[PDB]
Amino acid sequence: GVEIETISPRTFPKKGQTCVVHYTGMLQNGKKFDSSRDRNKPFKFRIGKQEVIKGFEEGAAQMSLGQRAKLTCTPDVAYGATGHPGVIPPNATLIFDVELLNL
């Protein structure tokens, strides 16, 4: 049930290539469990490395250069039964506002 809602919008990410993006997480209650903008550090990851949750990768695969979108991820594709102890509660969704700013 993954959905992508474009926020203020064609360069699709290549397979096995790194893409930097400043993403922000949000829960239904309203608490910020992570914030890349507050850390002031650009996050980098690889698609083929499979080091990130499947929901974030699936949302970034459909994104484009210079465009942000609320990537609503399914509970199973990201922390299905358990996640980080104390950060994400079990049986809960995870909304990531990915803002792809790759080169």
Author numbering: 1 to 9, 13 to 106
Sentences from the paper on this structure:
Each forms homotetrameric assemblies of ~5000 residue long subunits. Mutations in RyR1, the skeletal muscle isoform, can cause malignant hyperthermia (MH), central core disease (CCD), and other myopathies. Here, a collection of cryoEM structures provides insights into the molecular consequences of MHrelated RyR mutation R615C, and how apoCaM opens RyR1.
With the expected functionality of the R615C mutation confirmed, we solved cryo-EM structures of wild-type and R615C pRyR1, under nominally Ca2+-free conditions (5 mM EGTA), in the presence of FKBP12.6, which was used as a bait protein for purification. Despite identical experimental conditions, the overall R615C pRyR1 resolution is lower than for WT, potentially indicating a larger inherent heterogeneity. Superposing the N-terminal solenoid (Nsol) shows that loss of interactions mediated by Arg615 leads to pivoting movements of the neighboring solenoid regions (Bsol, Jsol) relative to Nsol. Locally, this results in shifts ~2–3 Å in the Bsol region near residue Glu2175, but due to the pivoting movement this is amplified further away from the mutation site, e.g., up to ~10 Å in the Bsol region around residue 2457. The N-terminal disease hot spot domains (NTD-A and NTD-B), located around the central 4-fold symmetry axis, are no longer forming inter-subunit interactions with the N-terminal domains of neighboring subunits, as observed for WT RyR1. The overall result is a widening of the cytosolic cap, with the corner regions moving downward toward the SR membrane. As a result, the pore is considerably widened, consistent with an open channel based on the position of the S6 helices. However, for R615C pRyR1, the main conformation of the Bsol region without apoCaM bound is different from either of the two conformations with apoCaM. Instead, it can be best described as a conformation that is ‘intermediate’ between the two when considering the degree of bending of the Bsol region.
